[PDB]
Write a protein that binds this DNA or RNA. Structure first.
Ligand SMILES: [Mg+2]
Ligand SMILES: [Mg+2]
Lengths: 695, 695, 79, 79
RNA sequence: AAAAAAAAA
């Protein structure tokens, strides 16, 4: 017999029902969380034996949208769900980023959270359900875990926040925000707004957290009822003796080494002191593990840089907390792309390039909620020659598929509606050099490229990453944190928006609790920095160009009869294939008879127009048709005319005189007008050169 | 001028042509076996130096179907043969399962059998040829190999067995089973039957074996003719000292431990026993091998459990040999799938979900034998959390593509005929906890889900996994064998049928010398257990539900006049594209007048069939024919009622005098009755107002 | 701020333009060679310290053609 | 391969039939694709020589021009 | 012989 421990409550409008104990009894824990007929079956399994000699914590969060949830057989050729799509990877990262800071420091047991989507209802997004389920499952399992973390989605409709809006409500909403936080403080935010002020975004965050408190309480109650006993896991007791021994020699020397302005001399000096210290540590006692010394050195460097930045001393870069690194904006750097730009900020650089295409190129996304065509593709490539180290290129890693979406949220607020711009822009952004805040450099470069290719975006956008170092009640916000500073910064949040409002927000706070006031001050400083960046960017190019680049495919429209569109289709599309091959353009066909002629140069456009038009023009009374006899036989020559319908001039209908040889009557290359009296349907169209040959 | 060695023999109606020595000389041995114009080129490469510290036999059998065998450029976009398809993986496992238990114990040199298919007669299936080829290659190579293994594929026609049938015959057979065994015993059987009785299945097995004795003899002849010298390979001699100091010190305590009925006490006891023995044995000598110590301990405990079950003591589970584990059955456990079930037996369970799709979703796979469209998809998912360990979710492994086909073979016997139920059932089963016999739990759950979703299967169908243990003349047969017991069992079966008959008989013996009476007794016990499981399942769901789920797309089939299809549809498919784009349904047509209407909503299909009946409206006597004339001309009254139905109203039938304005006597939009007098060949239709106003 | 070093010459018929120093400063070297409106951006990254106990030279050359070069969104179903 | 045969152009409509039922039935019977032009040239495309032979024979039975000495199978259906 | 335009681219 099976004893399913079910616990259901009320969340917003829907009724979440947590249900454990019945399935996957062999995994460490598994809950089937269902909200309003959308059910996600999350399950956690964490090994007990620490892998001997581990340095990083290996948490993986697979998320699978099984397409039998909506109730459809998959569309792939193998008829089976395969590699996870970009959406599923995005939601996996969205589940991953809240929980990882909650596992206590010094935990290195492999833990894997496989949240599959068994059933979906089109109004309720499964992702929030999966997040709630992941938190509930982790809390039930007894793996060392500090929060039972809720998830909430808030939307802005009629200036009033709505919790967990349905997709139809979401279409009206200005802002879509996901806030996942512990009982104590927010723990992550991943937004996409529509140029809202900072106060509105902050209110949304605080509202979502204050409301998801309920899910948190109820998961705690379930854990208390039917959870497993907590693991007997103790962090490695801090070897204060060795730490103090290394510190007594290293503290002042590394403080002064970091105190000097030049970066590379400090690099070399601290590396040689590191070599000296590890040499002494090994020589004095071989048994001491190398990774322990590495951790000690990491602690020393982190501590010294944090103590420095807290006291107000200039950062490792040498800038004040406000100062943004110098920028250099370049546009049209690529000769033949539809539009390109190169946004270098400090050491972070991005070569962004926007390319227009016709509606046939829009990605057709087949996801659980519904089929959806995308007419704005943003891809973000992070090649390994950026950081400075070799590495195998390949399919995009999760972080690239996450930052692609982040930059796309950054730019989506200002893209034009399809009726105003009937193209499908695709923006790529290769990161030639990275030193921190790469995705926001990509947002700036994408705004630049779009403004250059000729897209009529509303206003340029720019993104500035930020940081925050807090100890006790003393906190200093950091602007444009470097890659090195990112380790030090407690909270990393990225703000990207036009001058008016915030297009996208992506907080990722990690330590203790940050008061609303802290977030407000940080957001205001980010607004200032973003205004400065936008000014500098406006100095280079202030308004999108007049028209698209000459290479860009222009749009030409022609109207044709509905049967004629079938005629131009032909057998499986042979006529259209031949037409595009001979003219070199791209033609789109609709059932209502509109024709979309898309070609770069107007000459190819008019070539397509004339070539198609000859077939489009119906045979009309009085007007002669141009026909060339392709084959001559002794018993008659038929003048092939085209259009699927050929009229034959039988040997008995040419003249009453005995036609002896067609060669002496019709010569190779005889372009003569043919008198067509009518168009018959029986397939024997009457052609007559006799009336045209009398004169 | 190298010279091949060819030996050809009759094997049924087809003739087989083994041939070696000509190609692939550098491989350890290669054999081109061709049966009746179907040729499979099999080659085997066996390394000579075992990798240091190898513990498991790394034999990997590949199998590639080259699409140039049938004479066809590949369909794939790259026009190149891709990764192994499902059929190729299945046939690879087919080749693999017989030849693995045949290599002697302790052999660990890598071996690779690559079987390519270079020419395929669309009648004789290649898999049997490839099995004969792998057998001949391995037995020719001189790699230590017990006996050459022959393959057969018995069919069942007119209650008379038939050897190795052709697809034309196979379309009429009830059963096809691939019995492949060496001369001594039947190594493997893989079956699919239309509810055949056990006795018939066993007769088929023994018949196939008695027949492929020929292939055995003739591969033996070819080996004696043109073979290679057997390798000098000797098994590692067992260490009598280690065996003694483990046995006399621990085996009695281990027997007393396995005497304990509870699982956890026994676990703790065996742990303390092995730890104590390892501790004292290292205390005697540290150089003694820990790995070999644990291996010998495992051998001891295996011998203990085997001696326990043979004597007749209760098994590790505590069940008697006949009795099945516990059972629990739920249906409709998911909210929005078309049908679902959660068949949990003991500690092995599966969450199966059947999802009906329209006839456009059927998988169309291109095989060498010929392009075949598959309208029943079974998919088997074995995620890592099921067995209780973390892992790498990804593409399905070979086990998953083997058990998918096994379960699909088990259910295919009872699924309905396409005339009685036009859909495309796809069944997905996710194992959420597996402890042996997972695929048979999947079969039970699939029958359950099918009966839930509403498909009218002919009868419930369930599967059980038997196990056989034999020593000398004493043999005991187990039921619902666990995963741990699998090491102990020698012969594994997987009988899976309805109460009337068997549907799948996959089996894989290892020991040599099982009389067919043993198999008869085991099959009888399996019939008993399967009747029990079906009795339990009978409580949850009695018969398939009358109506499919409301979410299901609903297919309605109507019959229409085959001649009027060109009158109502017309050329180019204009109106059919119009209806499919206005109603959003999929409509296809046959030459006889059969048309299916597929739409995910009832009312939408009602609208579609309304449109079809209006456009195909006959000349019903007494029904009003409403025509809307908005503008009147001199030549007639143009009224649009669709279907190309236009009539010329003559001026001589309006009034006797010449009309100066038609609007004085004929009203705009007024309803005119139109009686069709006759339907001519040219499509001429006339309108009759005078005779239709009064009648 | 940053300034590139460019040197362009006549090569047969077209005019090649070698340009370095502007982009990809963090790689070991990187030059964007273009030959009459056809640019190719090559970057070399060599490790400073050899792998301990290495026997074969691990040169790996990758050449990727971004479809946006021609001016077309790619054709692959994932675009 | 492609098999080409020339039959009288006027006698096509006898074998094509109303709405092309005869030709489509014959094609699904022989598994090939027959092509006919207004001048009566019969173009048979086939994926095999045997299917080509089957289609060509079925064409000779009915589609061929009426030949003297060719025997017609006449069966009464009702007395 | 009824019908845009390719995970297986
Ligand atoms: Mg950062
Ligand atoms: Mg088993």
């Amino acid at each position: 017999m099976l004893n399913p421990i079910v616990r259901k409550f009320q969340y917003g409008q829907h009724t979440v029902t947590l249900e454990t104990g019945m399935m996957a009894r062999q995994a460490t824990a598994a809950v089937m969380v269902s909200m309003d007929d959308t059910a996600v079956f999350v399950t956690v399994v964490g090994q007990k034996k620490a892998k001997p000699g581990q340095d990083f914590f290996p948490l993986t969060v697979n998320y699978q949208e099984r397409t039998y949830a909506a109730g459809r057989i998959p569309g792939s050729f193998f008829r089976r769900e395969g590699r996870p799509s970009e959406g599923e990877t995005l939601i996996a990262r969205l589940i991953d980023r809240p929980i990882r800071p909650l596992f206590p420091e010094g935990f290195v047991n492999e833990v894997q959270v496989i949240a599959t989507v068994v059933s979906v209802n089109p109004q309720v997004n499964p992702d929030i359900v999966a997040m709630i389920g992941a938190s509930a499952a982790l809390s039930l399992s007894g793996i060392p875990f500090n929060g039972p973390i809720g998830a909430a989605r808030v939307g802005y409709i009629n200036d009033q926040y709505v919790l967990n809006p349905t997709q139809d409500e979401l279409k009206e909403s200005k802002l879509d925000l996901v806030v996942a936080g512990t009982e104590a403080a927010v723990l992550m935010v991943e937004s996409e707004a529509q140029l809202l002020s900072e106060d509105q975004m902050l209110g949304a965050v605080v509202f979502g957290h204050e409301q998801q408190q309920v899910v948190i309480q109820n998961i705690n109650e379930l854990v208390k009822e039917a959870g497993k006993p907590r693991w007997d896991w103790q962090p490695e007791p801090v070897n204060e003796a060795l730490n103090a021994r290394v510190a007594a020699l290293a503290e002042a020397r590394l403080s002064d080494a970091y105190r000097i302005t030049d970066k590379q001399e400090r690099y070399a000096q601290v590396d040689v002191i590191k070599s000296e210290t590890i040499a002494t540590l090994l020589a004095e006692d071989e048994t001491l593990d190398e990774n322990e010394l590495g951790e000690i050195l990491h602690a020393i460097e982190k501590n010294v840089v944090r103590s420095r930045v807290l006291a107000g001393e200039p950062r490792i870069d040498g800038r004040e907390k406000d100062m943004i690194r110098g920028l250099d904006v370049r546009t049209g750097v690529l000769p033949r792309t539809h539009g390109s730009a190169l946004f270098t900020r400090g050491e972070t650089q991005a070569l962004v390039t926007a390319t227009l295409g016709t509606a046939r190129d829009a990605q057709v996304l087949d996801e659980l909620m519904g089929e959806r065509t995308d007419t704005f593709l943003f891809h973000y490539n992070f090649p390994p020659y950026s950081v400075g180290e070799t590495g195998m290129v390949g399919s995009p890693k999760r972080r690239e598929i996450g930052h692609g979406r982040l930059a796309k949220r950054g730019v989506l607020a200002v893209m034009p509606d399809m009726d105003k711009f009937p193209y499908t822009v695709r923006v790529v952004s290769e990161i030639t050099e990275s030193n921190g805040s790469s995705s926001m450099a990509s947002v700036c470069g994408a705004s630049l490229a779009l403004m250059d290719a000729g897209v009529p975006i509303k206003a340029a956008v720019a993104g500035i990453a930020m940081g925050l170092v807090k100890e006790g009640d003393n906190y200093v916000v950091l602007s444009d944190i470097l890659g090195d500073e990112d380790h030090l910064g407690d909270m990393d949040f990225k703000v990207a928006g036009s001058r008016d409002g915030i297009s996208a927000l992506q907080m990722d706070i990690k330590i203790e609790g940050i008061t609303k006031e802290i977030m407000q001050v940080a957001l205001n400083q980010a607004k200032g920095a973003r205004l400065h960046i936008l000014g500098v960017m406006e100095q280079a190019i202030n308004a999108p160009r007049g028209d698209i680049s000459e290479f860009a495919p222009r749009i030409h429209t022609i109207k044709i009869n509905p049967d004629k569109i079938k005629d131009v289709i032909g057998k499986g599309g042979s006529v259209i294939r031949a037409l595009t091959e001979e003219t070199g353009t791209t033609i789109e066909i609709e059932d209502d008879g509109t024709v979309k002629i898309a070609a770069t140069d107007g000459e190819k456009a008019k070539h397509a127009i004339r070539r198609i038009e000859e077939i489009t023009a119906e045979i009309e009374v009085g007007r002669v048709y141009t026909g060339k006899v392709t084959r001559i036989v002794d018993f008659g020559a038929f003048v092939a005319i085209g259009g699927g319908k050929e009229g034959l001039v039988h040997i008995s209908q040419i003249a009453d005189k005995r036609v002896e040889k067609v060669t002496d009557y019709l010569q190779m290359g005889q372009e003569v007008p043919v008198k067509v009296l009518e168009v018959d349907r029986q397939g024997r169209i009457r052609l007559s050169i006799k009336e045209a040959t009398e004169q």
